[PDB]
Amino acid sequence: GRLATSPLKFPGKLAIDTLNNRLFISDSNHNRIIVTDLEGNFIVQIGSSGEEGFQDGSFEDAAFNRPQGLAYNAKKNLLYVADTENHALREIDFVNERVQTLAGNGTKGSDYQGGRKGTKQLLNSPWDVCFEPVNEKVYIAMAGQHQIWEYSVLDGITRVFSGNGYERNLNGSTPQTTSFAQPSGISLGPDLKEAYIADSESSSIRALDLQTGGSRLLAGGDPYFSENLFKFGDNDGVGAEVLLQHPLGVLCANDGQIYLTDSYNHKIKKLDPVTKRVVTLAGTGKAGFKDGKVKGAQLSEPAGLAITENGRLFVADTNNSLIRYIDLNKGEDSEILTLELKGVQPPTPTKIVKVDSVTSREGDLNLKISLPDGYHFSKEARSKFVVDVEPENAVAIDPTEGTLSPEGSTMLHFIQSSTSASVGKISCKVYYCQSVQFEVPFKVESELSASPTITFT
């Protein structure tokens, strides 16, 4: 059946180019973007090896790491990518067939304000993107920090747009009097005045004001206890009668109506943002795979949506690893069907290790390199390391070079020289019977000593 033959693995998100009839698939756990026509015929992929990585360049060289949201720039023929586990915003240029990084730098940030340019601005688990084509802004659902961010296409400034960073369903009128709760989907309204948000961990749909940074609650969740993350269930109705569970995807159609994936209830739902009425569109609520009449069909953790001008709604049916679609024009005779992918192959494939940032002024790095079963480190070729700090002298790292222990381990003492951020690079030549570079971000946020573990197998 369709499940056994799918070349996808947990596709999370979709975008569409309705002018040139292209579907963009975030094949998330294959670390690649697939481009097909609207009938599922393969056109091109970016990330054909399927390997996790963080690499700019040609379509042959580029690498992603569990990417999620996509947004298409019709004016420039570019695809924006929320490259979640690289904490980066990427750009796929179809004119020149190149990938480049717009913002973020591969390391998870803890910057709740931003305002830096391009790759000097760190991000935190960006999950979804949408492109506002008049003011040329990419809005980012920054799931890791419970915020919405704004990337300025014309100058690269990347900044917080809304949300104080606390996880709650709080709908104030200014960016610092709003909060989100794992926002994982974002879609612009027809007038480009609001963005609709899938606020996954409050189990609600919200509307963000693109002029003020304030937000309002449309349906789902607890309108009276902002801290309540347990107001979930599966109930159609109006406003506060509505229960959802962990919606990951949201889409605003040209007529202003909202489609959403009520992900943990295995349903597609329709929200009228004017009346706040939510009705089930497709799915019984039981996890599964069944095509046909929409009310009797089954999905499994659907998470992304895209729509054609003619009313064909595509769904990334994530846990089934399938793309499905519904023709909305059919009304109550609507059916959900599976996009049969054609010509889409499964993936056919110095190591870099991004390390979690070190937050203590002083401490020790516990470096351990593991081997597979059967292998052991060489004897007449001890594995040696060398240490460099990206701004020289920014961190004093006491053994700047040496040999690894018989277990492939070593301990390095460090102290940061100031209050600014830096990067330490530990380059290792390991002989077993490879070349691995650990990239360690450093920034001072505590005066207590830390002792992180740095690992590679």
Ligand code: NA
């Ligand atoms: Na999507």
